């Protein structure tokens, strides 16, 4: 796989973050996390779904650069969004996200599976660490 240059536009969500991505703005879901709501007609805002997309966005504001990376399978969700990991300053914001306890990993089945043991190793870390969603 290979990472790919960006620009940040907007930081959107837990999961979402909206990028110039080949001199073209579009918004990207970040692949194998699954974070707690923040705007949903049903149930509305879960517990952690603001911490998470108040890391999320420290990520990435406050990074120098920012990577797309694409995985092996669909590229693109239903609504649009881009599945990919994406890297602020070399670091993975999927990965650190869940290492905080702040997401979950989810499966998808789409092709997208190449960093599966990464995520679900920081998975379990926080989970030990009984981690914000793990506590």
Known sequence: LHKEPATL?????????????????MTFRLL??????????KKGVEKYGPEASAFT??????????????????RTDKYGRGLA??????????????????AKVAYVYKGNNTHEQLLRKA??????????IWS
Do not use: S
């Open 9 to 25: 536009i907007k930081a959107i969500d837990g999961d979402t973050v909206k990028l110039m991505y080949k001199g073209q703005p």
């Open 32 to 41: 194998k996390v699954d974070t707690p709501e923040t705007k949903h007609p």
């Open 57 to 74: 966005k420290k990520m990435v504001e406050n990074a120098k650069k920012i990577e797309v990376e694409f995985d092996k399978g669909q």
């Open 85 to 102: 990991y994406i890297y602020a300053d070399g670091k993975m914001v999927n990965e650190a996200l869940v290492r905080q306890g702040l």
């Open 123 to 132: 998975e379990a870390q926080a989970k030990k660490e009984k981690l914000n």
